[PDB]
Amino acid sequence: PYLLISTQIRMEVGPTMVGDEQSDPELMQHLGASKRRALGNNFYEYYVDDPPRIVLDKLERRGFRVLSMTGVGQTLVWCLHKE
Amino acid sequence: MPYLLISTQIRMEVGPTMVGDEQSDPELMQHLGASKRRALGNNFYEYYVDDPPRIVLDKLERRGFRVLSMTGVGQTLVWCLHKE
Amino acid sequence: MPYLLISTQIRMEVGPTMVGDEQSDPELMQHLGASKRRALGNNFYEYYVDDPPRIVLDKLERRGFRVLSMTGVGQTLVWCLHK
Amino acid sequence: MPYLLISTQIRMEVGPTMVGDEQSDPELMQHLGASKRRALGNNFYEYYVDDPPRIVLDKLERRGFRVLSMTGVGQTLVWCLHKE
Amino acid sequence: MPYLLISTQIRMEVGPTMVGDEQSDPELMQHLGASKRRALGNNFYEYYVDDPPRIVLDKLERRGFRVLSMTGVGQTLVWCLHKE
Amino acid sequence: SEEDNELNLPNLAAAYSSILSSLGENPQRQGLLKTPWRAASAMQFFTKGYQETISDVLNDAIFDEDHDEMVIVKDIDMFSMCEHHLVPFVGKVHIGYLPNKQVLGLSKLARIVEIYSRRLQVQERLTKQIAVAITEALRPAGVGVVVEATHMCMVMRGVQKMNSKTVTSTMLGVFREDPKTREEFLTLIR
Amino acid sequence: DNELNLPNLAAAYSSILSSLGENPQRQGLLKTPWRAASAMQFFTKGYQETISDVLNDAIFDEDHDEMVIVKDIDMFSMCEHHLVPFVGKVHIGYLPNKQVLGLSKLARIVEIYSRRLQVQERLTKQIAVAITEALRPAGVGVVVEATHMCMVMRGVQKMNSKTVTSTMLGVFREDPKTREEFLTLIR
Amino acid sequence: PRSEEDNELNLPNLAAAYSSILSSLGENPQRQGLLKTPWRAASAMQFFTKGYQETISDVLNDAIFDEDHDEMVIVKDIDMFSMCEHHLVPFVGKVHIGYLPNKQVLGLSKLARIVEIYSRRLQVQERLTKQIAVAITEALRPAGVGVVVEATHMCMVMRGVQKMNSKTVTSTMLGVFREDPKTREEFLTLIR
Amino acid sequence: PRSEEDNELNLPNLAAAYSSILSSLGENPQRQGLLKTPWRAASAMQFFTKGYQETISDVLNDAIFDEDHDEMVIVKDIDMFSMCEHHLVPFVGKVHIGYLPNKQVLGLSKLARIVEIYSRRLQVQERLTKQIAVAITEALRPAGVGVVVEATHMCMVMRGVQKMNSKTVTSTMLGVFREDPKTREEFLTLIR
Amino acid sequence: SEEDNELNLPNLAAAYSSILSSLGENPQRQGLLKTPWRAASAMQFFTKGYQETISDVLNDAIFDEDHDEMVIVKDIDMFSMCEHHLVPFVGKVHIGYLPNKQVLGLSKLARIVEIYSRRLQVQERLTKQIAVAITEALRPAGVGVVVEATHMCMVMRGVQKMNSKTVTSTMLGVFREDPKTREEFLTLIR
Amino acid sequence: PRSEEDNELNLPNLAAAYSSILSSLGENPQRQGLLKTPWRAASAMQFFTKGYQETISDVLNDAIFDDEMVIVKDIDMFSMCEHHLVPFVGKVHIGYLPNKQVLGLSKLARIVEIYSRRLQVQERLTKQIAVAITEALRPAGVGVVVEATHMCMVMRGVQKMNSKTVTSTMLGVFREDPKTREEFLTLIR
Amino acid sequence: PRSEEDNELNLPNLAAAYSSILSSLGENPQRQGLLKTPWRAASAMQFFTKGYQETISDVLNDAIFDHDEMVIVKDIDMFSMCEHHLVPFVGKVHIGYLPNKQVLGLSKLARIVEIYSRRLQVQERLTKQIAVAITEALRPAGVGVVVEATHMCMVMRGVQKMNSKTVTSTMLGVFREDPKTREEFLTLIR
Ligand SMILES: Nc1nc2c(ccn2[C@@H]2O[C@H](COP(=O)(O)OP(=O)(O)OP(=O)(O)O)[C@@H](O)[C@H]2O)c(=O)[nH]1
Ligand SMILES: Nc1nc2c(ccn2[C@@H]2O[C@H](COP(=O)(O)OP(=O)(O)OP(=O)(O)O)[C@@H](O)[C@H]2O)c(=O)[nH]1
Ligand SMILES: Nc1nc2c(ccn2[C@@H]2O[C@H](COP(=O)(O)OP(=O)(O)OP(=O)(O)O)[C@@H](O)[C@H]2O)c(=O)[nH]1
Ligand SMILES: Nc1nc2c(ccn2[C@@H]2O[C@H](COP(=O)(O)OP(=O)(O)OP(=O)(O)O)[C@@H](O)[C@H]2O)c(=O)[nH]1
Ligand SMILES: Nc1nc2c(ccn2[C@@H]2O[C@H](COP(=O)(O)OP(=O)(O)OP(=O)(O)O)[C@@H](O)[C@H]2O)c(=O)[nH]1
Ligand SMILES: Nc1nc2c(ccn2[C@@H]2O[C@H](COP(=O)(O)OP(=O)(O)OP(=O)(O)O)[C@@H](O)[C@H]2O)c(=O)[nH]1
Ligand SMILES: Nc1nc2c(ccn2[C@@H]2O[C@H](COP(=O)(O)OP(=O)(O)OP(=O)(O)O)[C@@H](O)[C@H]2O)c(=O)[nH]1
Ligand SMILES: N[C@@H](Cc1ccccc1)C(=O)O
Ligand SMILES: N[C@@H](Cc1ccccc1)C(=O)O
Ligand SMILES: N[C@@H](Cc1ccccc1)C(=O)O
Ligand SMILES: N[C@@H](Cc1ccccc1)C(=O)O
Ligand SMILES: N[C@@H](Cc1ccccc1)C(=O)O
Ligand SMILES: [Zn+2]
Ligand SMILES: [Zn+2]
Ligand SMILES: [Zn+2]
Ligand SMILES: [Zn+2]
Ligand SMILES: [Zn+2]
Ligand SMILES: [Zn+2]
Ligand SMILES: [Zn+2]
């Protein structure tokens, strides 16, 4: 039911992080997400080139609703829930 | 287009207020009196208004949007609105 | 005028509390006991009260306002109210 | 007095938790087991408890308060509660 | 025990996720597969899991918890949950 | 062009000879006989940046390295001419950028400084032109430029503030949007 | 390979002496083709090394996670575009994940990549990647500061110019607080 | 803990081993300059490892004072001399210590004495750095402790890699010095 | 507060104690170089502890101006000479003071005179640092005060641990200097 | 000559391409494609002193003055090439002289450093050639030349003494004969 | 010379005098921070004047060996002014020209410790170090330079915070031959 | 002279002696951090005394070329071992000489420092050995050697004088007889 999405530095432009190693593969495919591991990181991530506003509209069509939005460092995070 | 992101920097009482990106609804941007620009070195266009964010929020309520969340990140104050 | 933005700096237990901008409702500013000022070098006027934010929130509830969101940005704590 | 502001610094799992200001409800401060102090150089009094914030939140629910918002500002984690 | 505080540092996609303090529900900590530790110099014990926070949030929904608020503070991302 | 330089050299020498007479000096004395020509050639060299284009200066020195890390060329000696008084302003340029898969040849950053500094200028314009030229040539994630200079018009004359220095800064792309990238750049140029 | 290629390098250096207008038979130049060839092989000795041999199993357990830095490591490399030296210092920082590297190995890793025909950016990245793969730490930060002689002795001739390159991996990239502690401690 | 009686008993064994080293290096232990070396080298090595003879309790010597003091205390530029355990060659430098008291304040000199207990041993920089921080944490129970050790390892300068300017910097941040970046930043600013 | 009459009355008792110290060290109080030493050492010790003769109110001398300045004021590099209460040996260095006035601005020199009241006593660095900050806070009621003391303790260099380069840095941050990290950062940047 | 440079450039490039292969490198990789030509041009620039003569460098910049006082041009950046290893040696040259009737143009003292330093050299010879060129061109009462240099052959290889510096000194005419003149020179170049 | 038995017998007298000084200054010797001060101040004063317990012969130990300049410079020195009983601290730079006897390097610093750890005047201290080396080694010459900050001139009295006293003693060839003295002064910079 | 065969034959004896030292100090030679220490300490000690494996003739390697100038190689990093305590003494060596028809290869002056410093020594002997070796190899008009070193035996133990430095000087030939030559040398090594 829970989803975490994020963007860095500016909210108007991507990349947008949309998942982790254990994310729903069908949802990642639906968003057009690619999988990568940044150098030195102990984890894989899914990302899209789209700005977060576009990702939020796509997720609403999948039954997700934004519960909370927060800034942490230079990262803007949205916590969504499939209600 | 149900989601909207708006923002202001440094002080909340004064504009400019960022109200959109390249793929924003052009009619909504025109309604807000927004101008389009690309800051030097940036890989994207943005829409902005001279109005402080409180004025933009009142105008957006008259278009069916409600504030879902408000957050600070760096020196930017962001509002996430939803058309409901 | 359904939306209101209020704020305090450095500590939440003490004022001043910023309660408005140049285009704020003059009657609401008078009701809160707010004064108008322009800090040196600023391109805008602001309304403020000496009261801590908890007192201002209680006064605004009696005027029909409800807190929708509260956030920190730099050393400023902001409340977004709606009526 | 419908609104309440509580906070903790540096880590969320341990106190002290700030639970009030000079004009806070004295009965509620006594119920929480709060002490009153003034940190050196400060122009205000504060109420605090040794309990971590999770314990304070549970005690406040038993008094009719509900968390409306939680935010970070600097090294302070703040909760805004409302008696509803 | 209606309130719960969970957190992660530096990146949201990977653990550890902090899920409790010394007075947390031992059954809930055991259910999450949490370990107890005291970081050097700290005056408190904490419970943590290796899972990323998204996994912990899904497990907590199955226990009756709902996210009320999410916030960043320093390099820590915090969720405040409530058993409603 | 170099043809313009040859054609304008006698006009510059005539103007410098006229300046020598108008100052009360004797253009015929030994020490001043070649001065109209030497001053004219020096002024042409100080303004040689007008003869250059970014394309020629770059000379295809753009490489492909999978670099997404900060690159800095600091302490680049800079010599410019104040456009208000025709007196030098000299100092250092510190340049930083975050590549976007195109990496510029290290020396080309200093050559870009030479195009704009060898002109009649103002520090603010010079600083901005260096940052904009790198941005347009490489299309990077961001560019930061810091110029520190002593203006001889503020030390040899006018206000005569012997220690005064002007520092100008231009931050584009991620160097403006991300304070962490700007802070890493300012820490590394110390 | 070095022994077999030494006469070919000496023949090329002797040819360079003649092509510059010099006399390879003059006293001061007689041994120059051989000495220049040996110097060039020493400057490119990093191609003879592998990370595994250089590490020499000098990886030890350190349970407490503290920042470890080896700074001011003198570095001497060769520009691949002009075959002229670029020299300076390397500052390395890392946050261990239960494994700590032998102090000297951080400088030996600098030697593997610096003693090659290079570009500063690639050199900086290679040092950070080698440490990341050998130790699997929480993160690594590498800062290289160098004077390229191609920018001072010729070309632009900017006497004081210096190139600074930075590579931040793992927590050194993701956590600005870790990167700031590293940059503060290398001053 | 090593005793002064242990030192007297082991001194002839250390001198015999150093005399053997002189012969194995090709030197003449009978020449004037080397006659007393087996004994002088043995005594120097016992002094370099005198930290094994000490306890935190004896070193503290009850120099813990009480105070309504909740402000940062730093003792910086403490000269430190240690022995690398891998090569038995010195590593030398400075130790900078900071702490935020919790009603108990350590005697200023004791912070340097704690550096002496651990540095005068066969060590590794990382272990030395955590031992100083852990000793202060356990003795005072403060809000936090920060320790920075900067050292020149002679094994990296006189031999091996031979990087003349190389320096090792190790840092340990405990309690509020780890949890609060603002406390750590004040500490790092004040030790410059 | 100690008076000039107390000083005159106690001077012979101090001189008798210093003469006794000369004899107890094995020295000859009758030799030319030591004849006046009991009196000079007694006068020097009274001067080193002259801060006991002063009060904040007299030292301030009504040098409080009502100019509404809302900007940072710093007096740095104030030479400080104090006396360690535990060993009666000097500790010397510098004091750096910063404050954000509210409605009252203190006279520049009084910040250095406040350093003199507390430093010219038998002290401990921590207490001295706190006393300077508390005196400024109570005298002006500003938005906040920051005080940094850096000192060499002769008890750690001439004796004991004998760490020649060691320095103690103590910090006290009150009001906005504690609550606002941005104010504290501006202060620490400007005192470098 | 510049004609010699054009004719020999392909031969130098062929030798540098051969060096790339003999070192185990791939001359076809992107970073090395133009290296044979760039290395050849850099080596010709490092040895451009062979294209110059003292007479052309002086350019008749000898003035007649009633100056019989000490003239020094110090901290002249110098970049040379060791003739034994073909590796740079770099540093500073400090020149002093006591004019008799002729005073040399200030910049020519630095140009004289350039004629001899831009060659395959040994520091001692370089030092002597600068002093002798000034002595023969001006016939002064005396000349003093001090060259301080870091040899990269002693830093990057061989003995690898990172801080080592070579200082050579040539004192001619009154700079040798009168210790008071040499002491004034050495005091003024600090 | 002062002995360890003399130290045990005189340590209570020093402590009693410091307790009396605490009372005479207006302080309370019974307050927590001052309880141990009479003993600590006494021990510190014995340590500052431990040089009276030492002789040149004991210090010379096994450190004399059987014609080039030898210098030990930047020797940290901590002494006590005999006029005010307040420290004067700085550096000692020693140079000598051997005559068939060379001294152990460390002993030059130990010689500084014998005379500096006493109640002194800079001039006497400087001369005593030069004379001790001259008599122990019989060299061609000795040069001694002392640079010190006197706390009696900076914490009180004239209060000249930058003032420094430099004293010099040149014996044998260091006095007779200006070329030897000039080489010494150049090499100690 | 010591050889690599003597080194390999004596390595187990050195390791046995270092293992014995670990036990005699109260340490545990079986703990992880000390397991290879007897061998690593033994190898380090034979590297610190590698000077016994060398001779002046091999080190010079015929690098003697066929001047009227002072030649100086200063700031040569020096690492030696005190023979009395077997503890390092480290610093710098500054060498100057006036050639007499024979000039020594620059690096050999640093190689000569290596032969004598890589031994159990006393500073005075080391200083004299360097000056005598140059004197005998070149037969110059004179040689001057200045060694400045921190003895760890005076800082880490004993007197514990943190800032103490030993400076030793040897002046031979004209460097002793002519004060003007010695003064030029001392001025140029600053
Ligand atoms: N922002 C900017 N300004 C620049 C330069 C270069 C020069 N200038 C400034 O032009 C102004 C001209 O003023 P003016 O007409 O009054 O001249 P004049 O009486 O001679 O002045 P003064 O010098 O005071 O004697 C001066 O203020 C000078 O500083 C630059 O790079 N950036
Ligand atoms: N990013 C990067 N670039 C590097 C090196 C080493 C060298 N280079 C750069 O290659 C470019 C080659 O250009 P080119 O073909 O035009 O040559 P040439 O006419 O001789 O140039 P120039 O020297 O300007 O006269 C130069 O820009 C040089 O700086 C490095 O480490 N990192
Ligand atoms: N982390 C840490 N590491 C330390 C010390 C002290 C020493 N060491 C390191 O032990 C490693 C041993 O490796 P090894 O067996 O291959 O030895 P050896 O061939 O002689 O090496 P080298 O010196 O390269 O010639 C080296 O890397 C050395 O630096 C410390 O404090 N912290
Ligand atoms: N916090 C604080 N501490 C201070 C001073 C001034 C002094 N002190 C410290 O009192 C302690 C007394 O201990 P003690 O009884 O064991 O004495 P003693 O054997 O002579 O010690 P030592 O010097 O090690 O030989 C010492 O640690 C000394 O440093 C200050 O300003 N702040
Ligand atoms: N006087 C003088 N000497 C000069 C130069 C330039 C170089 N040289 C010196 O010729 C010597 C050649 O010896 P060699 O054959 O043994 O070579 P090689 O094994 O590579 O040596 P090394 O470096 O020790 O490894 C070296 O000593 C070198 O320093 C100069 O300007 N002045
Ligand atoms: N030559 C020499 N002189 C020395 C010392 C140590 C101290 N002194 C000097 O004895 C004088 C004492 O004078 P007095 O009686 O008048 O004392 P007092 O009023 O307290 O003096 P003051 O300090 O001026 O206030 C002072 O001049 C002091 O400097 C030394 O090493 N060498
Ligand atoms: N001239 C000269 N002297 C040298 C060295 C190297 C060392 N030495 C000196 O031999 C002396 C031996 O004396 P000793 O037996 O009493 O030793 P020990 O009790 O351990 O001494 P200490 O250090 O005081 O504790 C010391 O004085 C030492 O400094 C050198 O290069 N030149
Ligand atoms: N490291 C992120 C902050 C962050 C912390 C926790 C979770 C997610 C993000 C930044 O600096 O932008
Ligand atoms: N770059 C913004 C923060 C931000 C991050 C992510 C999204 C939006 C804004 C600032 O520094 O103010
Ligand atoms: N400038 C504010 C932050 C802020 C940004 C945007 C809007 C409002 C406030 C501070 O530093 O406290
Ligand atoms: N001063 C707080 C931040 C804060 C600002 C405003 C209100 C409450 C708290 C901190 O640095 O942690
Ligand atoms: N100390 C945390 C911030 C924090 C403050 C308060 C509560 C929880 C977390 C950090 O720097 O990441
Ligand atoms: Zn101008
Ligand atoms: Zn190049
Ligand atoms: Zn080692
Ligand atoms: Zn003390
Ligand atoms: Zn060479
Ligand atoms: Zn005195
Ligand atoms: Zn020794």
Side-chain angles (χ1 to χ4, degrees), chain D residues 31-47:
Chain D
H31 175 250
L32 298 175
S35 293
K36 193 182 188 185
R37 74 172 168 209
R38 185 183 147 271
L40 297 186
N42 285 3
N43 57 337
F44 67 96
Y45 298 89
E46 66 205 26
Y47 284 99

Side-chain angles (χ1 to χ4, degrees), chain I residues 84 86-87 155:
Chain I
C84 166
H86 303 298
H87 292 95
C155 309

Side-chain angles (χ1 to χ4, degrees), chain H residues 84-125:
Chain H
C84 156
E85 71 187 17
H86 293 264
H87 292 103
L88 304 180
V89 167
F91 70 97
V92 303
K94 308 281 178 102
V95 184
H96 316 292
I97 300 171
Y99 80 102
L100 218 288
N102 209 299
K103 261 63 230 165
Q104 294 160 63
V105 185
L106 187 45
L108 292 172
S109 82
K110 309 313 172 164
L111 296 168
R113 298 220 180 256
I114 289 159
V115 170
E116 282 293 299
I117 312 168
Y118 298 116
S119 66
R120 300 294 194 173
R121 293 176 177 208
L122 297 188
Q123 285 277 10
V124 287
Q125 219 174 301

Side-chain angles (χ1 to χ4, degrees), chain A residues 4-71:
Chain A
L4 295 179
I5 77 166
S6 72
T7 202
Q8 291 177 115
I9 303 162
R10 287 296 298 260
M11 72 191 193
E12 301 91 341
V13 66
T16 299
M17 301 304 116
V18 297
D20 56 77
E21 318 170 324
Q22 297 168 266
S23 282
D24 180 354
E26 145 59 36
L27 180 60
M28 301 298 102
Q29 189 192 55
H30 174 250
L31 298 175
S34 294
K35 192 183 189 183
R36 74 172 168 209
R37 193 187 79 224
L39 295 191
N41 286 3
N42 59 333
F43 68 96
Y44 287 89
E45 65 205 27
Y46 283 98
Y47 75 94
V48 296
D49 293 325
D50 306 288
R53 189 200 112 249
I54 296 297
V55 183
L56 293 173
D57 292 350
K58 288 186 184 185
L59 299 171
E60 163 144 333
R61 300 166 167 268
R62 280 291 175 103
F64 292 91
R65 178 162 284 271
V66 170
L67 289 197
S68 187
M69 175 192 62
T70 202

Side-chain angles (χ1 to χ4, degrees), chain F residues 32-90:
Chain F
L32 296 181
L33 281 168
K34 309 186 160 144
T35 300
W37 300 100
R38 279 173 316 211
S41 296
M43 192 56 154
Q44 288 190 332
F45 185 83
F46 299 149
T47 56
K48 71 186 171 69
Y50 296 127
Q51 202 194 141
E52 307 184 324
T53 181
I54 186 186
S55 284
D56 286 359
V57 158
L58 260 49
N59 196 47
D60 272 319
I62 297 176
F63 321 121
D64 192 26
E65 203 69 37
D66 313 87
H67 215 56
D68 39 40
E69 308 286 358
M70 190 171 294
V71 183
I72 288 164
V73 178
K74 69 173 182 188
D75 295 326
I76 301 163
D77 289 292
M78 186 278 295
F79 311 101
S80 193
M81 203 78 155
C82 161
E83 69 187 13
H84 296 272
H85 298 94
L86 306 177
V87 169
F89 74 95
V90 307

Side-chain angles (χ1 to χ4, degrees), chain J residues 54 58 60-65 67-69 71-73 95-106 108-109 112 130-144 175:
Chain J
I54 301 163
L58 292 178
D60 277 323
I62 297 174
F63 323 127
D64 298 303
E65 285 197 44
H67 202 63
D68 266 36
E69 301 289 359
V71 183
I72 290 165
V73 178
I95 301 172
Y97 80 102
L98 252 192
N100 176 18
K101 313 157 189 321
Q102 299 152 64
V103 338
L104 188 67
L106 293 176
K108 311 312 180 187
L109 296 172
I112 285 168
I130 293 164
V132 167
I134 298 166
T135 300
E136 293 180 343
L138 289 174
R139 299 181 193 182
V143 184
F175 281 60

Side-chain angles (χ1 to χ4, degrees), chain I residues 84-91 153-156 159, chain K residues 40:
Chain I
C84 166
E85 71 181 24
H86 303 298
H87 292 95
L88 304 178
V89 171
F91 71 95
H153 286 248
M154 292 303 153
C155 309
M156 296 185 300
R159 56 159 305 284
Chain K
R40 289 195 284 233

Side-chain angles (χ1 to χ4, degrees), chain H residues 1-185:
Chain H
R2 200 175 79 191
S3 322
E4 216 105 75
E5 189 177 27
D6 293 333
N7 287 0
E8 291 180 272
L9 291 176
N10 284 295
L11 192 73
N13 289 148
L14 283 168
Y18 279 113
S19 186
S20 170
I21 286 164
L22 296 178
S23 302
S24 306
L25 292 168
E27 263 284 11
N28 179 12
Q30 311 303 129
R31 73 173 174 89
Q32 191 207 63
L34 295 182
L35 280 169
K36 299 192 175 249
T37 299
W39 292 289
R40 275 184 302 217
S43 291
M45 193 55 159
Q46 284 179 332
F47 185 82
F48 299 150
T49 58
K50 72 186 170 67
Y52 297 128
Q53 307 175 209
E54 307 183 324
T55 296
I56 289 281
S57 168
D58 287 355
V59 159
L60 257 53
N61 194 42
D62 272 319
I64 298 174
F65 316 107
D66 299 304
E67 212 175 310
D68 309 45
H69 205 73
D70 38 41
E71 307 290 351
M72 191 171 293
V73 182
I74 291 168
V75 179
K76 70 175 181 189
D77 296 325
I78 302 162
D79 290 294
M80 184 279 297
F81 311 100
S82 199
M83 285 292 293
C84 156
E85 71 187 17
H86 293 264
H87 292 103
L88 304 180
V89 167
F91 70 97
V92 303
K94 308 281 178 102
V95 184
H96 316 292
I97 300 171
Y99 80 102
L100 218 288
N102 209 299
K103 261 63 230 165
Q104 294 160 63
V105 185
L106 187 45
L108 292 172
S109 82
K110 309 313 172 164
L111 296 168
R113 298 220 180 256
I114 289 159
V115 170
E116 282 293 299
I117 312 168
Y118 298 116
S119 66
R120 300 294 194 173
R121 293 176 177 208
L122 297 188
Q123 285 277 10
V124 287
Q125 219 174 301
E126 296 93 331
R127 182 195 304 136
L128 171 58
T129 312
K130 349 180 261 75
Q131 282 171 331
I132 294 162
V134 169
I136 298 165
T137 301
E138 294 179 343
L140 288 173
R141 301 281 168 205
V145 184
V147 178
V148 171
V149 179
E150 336 171 298
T152 294
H153 282 246
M154 292 302 154
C155 314
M156 293 177 60
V157 170
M158 292 179 69
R159 57 152 307 277
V161 290
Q162 302 181 265
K163 293 299 181 178
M164 313 297 184
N165 296 299
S166 65
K167 294 162 196 77
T168 300
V169 179
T170 50
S171 200
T172 290
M173 303 287 166
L174 310 181
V176 295
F177 281 59
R178 175 190 51 249
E179 311 298 345
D180 182 12
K182 303 286 135 183
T183 297
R184 180 171 64 250
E185 285 156 13

